[PDB]
From a paper:
Transcription-export complex 2 (TREX-2, or THSC) facilitates localization of actively transcribing genes such as GAL1 to the nuclear periphery, contributes to the generation of export-competent mRNPs and influences gene expression through interactions with Mediator. TREX-2 is based on a Sac3 scaffold to which Thp1, Sem1, Cdc31 and Sus1 bind and consists of three modules: the N-region (Sac3∼1-100), which binds mRNA export factor Mex67:Mtr2; the M-region, in which Thp1 and Sem1 bind to Sac3∼100-550; and the CID region in which Cdc31 and two Sus1 chains bind to Sac3∼720-805.
Crystals were obtained of the Sac360-550:Thp1:Sem1 complex that had P212121 symmetry with a = 78.2 Å, b = 84.1 Å, c = 165.5 Å and which diffracted to 2.3 Å resolution using synchrotron radiation. In addition to the previously determined structures of Thp1, Sem1 and Sac3 residues 255–551, Sac3 residues 82–255 were clear and easily traced, but reliable density corresponding to residues 60–81 was not observed, possibly indicating that this region was disordered. The Sac360-550:Thp1:Sem1 crystal structure indicated that the TPR-like repeats of Sac3 indeed extend to residue 137 and identified unequivocally the residues in the three major helices. Remarkably, in the Sac360-556:Thp1:Sem1 complex crystals, Sac3 Arg256 was completely buried between the PCI region determined previously (residues 250–556) and the additional three helices (residues 137–250), where it formed a complex network of H-bonds to Asp293, Ser289 and Met203, and to Arg286, Ser289 and Lys238 through water S213 that was augmented with hydrophobic interactions with Ile256, Leu261 and Cys200. In addition to the three additional helices of the TPR-like repeat region, the crystal structure of the Sac360-556:Thp1:Sem1 complex showed that Sac3 residues 90–125 formed a remarkable extended loop that linked the distal region of the Sac3 TPR-like region to the N-terminal region of Thp1. The loop made extensive contacts with Thp1 and buried 1528 Å2 of surface area. However, the second positively charged cluster centered on Sac3 Arg256 that has been proposed to be involved in the interaction with Mediator was buried by the residues in the additional TPR region below residue 250 and so was inaccessible in the complete M-region structure.
Author numbering:
A (entry chain C): 27 to 41, 57 to 89
B (entry chain B): 1 to 455
C (entry chain A): 79 to 547
Amino acid sequence: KSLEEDDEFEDFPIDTNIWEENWDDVEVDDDFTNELKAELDRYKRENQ
Amino acid sequence: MDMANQLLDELAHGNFSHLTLNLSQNGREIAILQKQLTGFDDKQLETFVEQHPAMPNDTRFKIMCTSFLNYARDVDPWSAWSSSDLIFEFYQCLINCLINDNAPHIEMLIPVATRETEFIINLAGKLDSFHLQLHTRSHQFLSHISSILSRLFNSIKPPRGNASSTNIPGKQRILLYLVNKLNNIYFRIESPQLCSNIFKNFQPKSMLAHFNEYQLDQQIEYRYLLGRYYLLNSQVHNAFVQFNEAFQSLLNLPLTNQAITRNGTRILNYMIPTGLILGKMVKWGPLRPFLSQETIDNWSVLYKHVRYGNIQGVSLWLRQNERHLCARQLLIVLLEKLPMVTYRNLIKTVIKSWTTEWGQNKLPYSLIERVLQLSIGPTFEDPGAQEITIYNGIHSPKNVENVLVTLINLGLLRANCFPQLQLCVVKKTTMIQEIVPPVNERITKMFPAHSHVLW
Amino acid sequence: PDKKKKYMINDAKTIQLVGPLISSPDNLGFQKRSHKARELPRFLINQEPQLEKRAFVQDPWDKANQEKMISLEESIDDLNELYETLKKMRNTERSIMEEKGLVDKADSAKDLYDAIVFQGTCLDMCPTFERSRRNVEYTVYSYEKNQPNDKKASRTKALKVFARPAAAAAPPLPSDVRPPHILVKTLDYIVDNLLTTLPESEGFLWDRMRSIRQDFTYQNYSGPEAVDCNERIVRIHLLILHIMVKSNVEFSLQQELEQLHKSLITLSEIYDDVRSSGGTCPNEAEFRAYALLSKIRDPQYDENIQRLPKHIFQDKLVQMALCFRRVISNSAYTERGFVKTENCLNFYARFFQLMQSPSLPLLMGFFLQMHLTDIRFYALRALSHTLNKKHKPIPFIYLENMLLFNNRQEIIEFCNYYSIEIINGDAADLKTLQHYSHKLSETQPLKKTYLTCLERRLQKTTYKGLING
């Protein structure tokens, strides 16, 4: 159990793009973002 | 047949088939030896070695052979503790036979030393777990091993600038092996900063022109430990390039074993948060074989909170994940360095609809305070939060200017600020990236890391 | 030396618990042999400090001899005669206590395979011999005399000086070192009698508290008294930091902060050993928090705190200290040998909000006041980078509320120190700030300062109450 959860590498007998190119362009309407946009609307309407 | 005489014949000629502390390999031979050595005192064992015909005329080699006869004579296989003085004494004598680069049989001894090193490390952890019962301090055994391996490491010299041959002596072939064993020990005894000298002196001692000339498994583990060492010192980008290269190299290993999956998982546990601090988010595709769906879901929640500027969500996430994050030394660095990426994204959305869309150049502080009110949520001052916490005591909606000042100083927001007008002005443009540039490029330009390829 | 050889644990239940090397040795031809006991390997020697109280024991001759030195201190009215006769007695005493095995021979420092469990037997707050010496050397503080015009140090008031290597070439005798319960008694005396003499007694108390901690290390003692004494000494250091800065009395923050740090290191080590032994220390969390503030930008202390138990990590005091380490972090902090790190907060505004919280423990606040100037410099440095070239100077009223300066004179002196041009006598032209480091190359740091709100809180309590918790 300890050998599989420990941060130390396990021994074994010895014998590509992984990152989002950009996440600012890939915009997905989020719940928190919806409430934020709504707060921007409320602020825009209450202020000249 | 006199098996002690047979053993010494073998050892004198560099045949170390039976020179091992592992009784699951050595048992029957050692048992016969123990029976036959019974009755001979220490001076007699010493003399057997001293006068053996082919014995190399080397003080340390004879000390090692004698140490092994003592071990064989007195070993009590029923008690790892009782036998430990023989075991650790012999191991030290064995490594001492590698200190001189021209020691007898040193090349035959190198594989023995690595084999025995793995045995004694495992036995040291076993005995260290009983330190209270053994009246030893924490990590006393394994720390004694680190000292032995440290003296060996210091005895490995770099190549002569004009060496006569390409020969890789054994001490060089195990240089990285030794670096990793030693640094792993320093992590296990909870003194990772002792890695400093090891890391510092690794490349100067190496004879290989390129780091990539070592075994790829040893490269990956080295980058793993170096990345963790960097992250312990909060050098996020320096850590990232190591974790990122470690995983890339691992993806280039044939997944022959489950331990490779779990080693990749160990890298990702640090590469993910490290990259997030630097404004990078993974594509889960290449990571599916190394992460469970739940771990993906978990980091994806945090991704969502950071991505869209929800400070309260980040703090809630860290709070929920506090325990295992502390165990991997990840809580503080994330608590400290995730915010400004989250802030950047918060005001990113604000500036998008307010400036790019609605064409307003000026950002009144009052507006950003309202935005921060939504993003921060509760604070140590607010009701219902009587006691200060790392999750409610750092971020406050009142400190609008401060947030913007640091965003500008980190280069994440290009803006001028007017404290007596209580607003900050961005450039009047429809291109949001002109006001809020890509995070990663900014951070990495401000904090250039050392060459991802060490050499 | 030839101290009795030491042997490995051959206890049976221990051996059974640790287990064997392999499962069925008999299957491989092994026979259970009655191996003779072998001596403990050098690398398994345990020099861990004592963690538990031990009965005080004193050699009968040692006791009678110290009683004799006291009686001679009372009977020999002459000042130099006393010291000369006590010097003779000390010469006899050393060789005697050496022969008893109660002090290492001054001949040579010996291998730790044979170490003496040194027990201090001085029952005064200052050894009688030292009292007679410092009488001759005229290094007796007024605080150590019954009457001001006295020349002899008082047995009831004198406090042992921190032993310096210049003197004491040979190891200290038992009569030179106070046992743990007398060290507690001595600190009790400081807390009850001498705190109010600050700031004038700062050099005295600093040296004497150093000596208390030194006597514990002479005896290799990490027991409850050593924890309690180091804990309250740390608190006294923190109180001194404010008192000295508030009073403007010239002192060495350096030497105060060094010993404060060393005392916290000692405490961290004891807390660790106590945890390893299954014990606990009730105040640990408080002093882990202080330790987190001693090197506020050193990541090592964030490393160490993250591996402690949950109840320590989640203690409000540790949480507060962690908040401070976070708001103080700054990616532009500049100092030879400091590596800048990513995405720091530089939350100077939050820092000064927290410094004003009534939930901030006062002694913690005293520790954090050490960074007021640094935080203020990097606040203005950061703010100035956001101002366009033709932006007006920033009024002092604004920066005073933002950085919580005590008064107008302080912010003027601050700008003068960092060559920030002052316009109209009430405004700071931040663009004129040419420094990128709080530490100026060719001049000494700006004097330490304090916050009015923490001075006001101090005046509402007692020093004693703060030191006792």
